[PDB]
């Protein structure tokens, strides 16, 4: 019926109403450090941040979405691979039922208790909707999360999820800094691939950090108290929201450090 994260509408059935689900620039894959070629040529991160407006934040059904005013050049996402200026549209996590799973990409086959996603627009575009249509339309950077100390700046988006419990729900989530998401370093592999869910448009730049932010278990607890199902509906725990790896097929990744 409609896709989703179950036995009968798992991934492995994706294929079936979106077709591009055995595409040749699908996303997740498995980042083999020892195959990414080193790229001088490819210019560091820049992310312009001061002035993110966030606006909302809502469960859709599989995730949960903080959105931001992408009206203007507020937050933005240039250099690296990237030609032009992405604006900031949303952020939202991949995570698991337990520690050993969860991240959508994979570092040597080695998967992270759960995977930020900042996902972008190109400007050029005018708009996320025509962005989506055009191979260079997106830029997403993806934050492995591994479990350890928490991170006090994913403190306040962790107290609100009691208020967004079910598919649907949204509270307003103003005022948020999404610069208390980073790592210290920038350093990334890149590759061009798809969104990782339905539609999986093959429309992504991808922009994946080395290095991981760590988080308690207790703030990973929280994300799988979630629901996936509506309210008055039978409880299913929003948890394994997560795509396995897709063959590389015509790709290379590219390190921006050695
Ligand atoms: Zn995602
Ligand atoms: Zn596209």
Not at 22 to 45: C, M, N, W
Not at 129 to 154: E, H, M, N, Y
């Amino acid at each position: 019926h409609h896709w989703g994260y179950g036995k009968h509408n798992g991934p492995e059935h994706w294929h079936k109403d979106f077709p591009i689900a055995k595409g040749e620039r699908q996303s997740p894959v498995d980042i083999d450090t020892h195959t990414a070629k080193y790229d001088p040529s490819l210019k560091p991160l820049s992310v312009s941040y001061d002035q993110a407006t966030s606006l909302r934040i809502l469960n859709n059904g599989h995730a949960f979405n903080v959105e931001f005013d992408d009206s203007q050049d507020k937050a933005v996402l240039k250099g690296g691979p990237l030609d032009g200026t992405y604006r900031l549209i949303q952020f939202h996590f991949h995570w698991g039922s337990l520690d050993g799973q969860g991240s959508q990409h994979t570092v040597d086959k080695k998967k992270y208790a759960a995977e930020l996603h900042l996902v972008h627009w190109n400007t050029k575009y005018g708009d996320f909707g025509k962005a989506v249509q055009q191979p260079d339309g997106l830029a997403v950077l993806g934050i492995f999360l591994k479990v350890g100390s928490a991170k006090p700046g994913l403190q306040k988006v962790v107290d609100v999820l009691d208020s967004i419990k079910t598919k649907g729900k949204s509270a307003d989530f103003t005022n948020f800094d999404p610069r208390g998401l980073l790592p210290e370093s920038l350093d990334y592999w890149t590759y061009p691939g798809s969104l990782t869910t339905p539609p999986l448009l093959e429309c992504v730049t991808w922009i994946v950090l080395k290095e991981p932010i760590s988080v308690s278990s207790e703030q990973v607890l929280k994300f799988r108290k979630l629901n996936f199902n509506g309210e008055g509906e039978p409880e299913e725990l929003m948890v394994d929201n997560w795509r396995p790896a897709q063959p590389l097929k015509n790709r290379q990744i590219k390190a921006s450090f050695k």
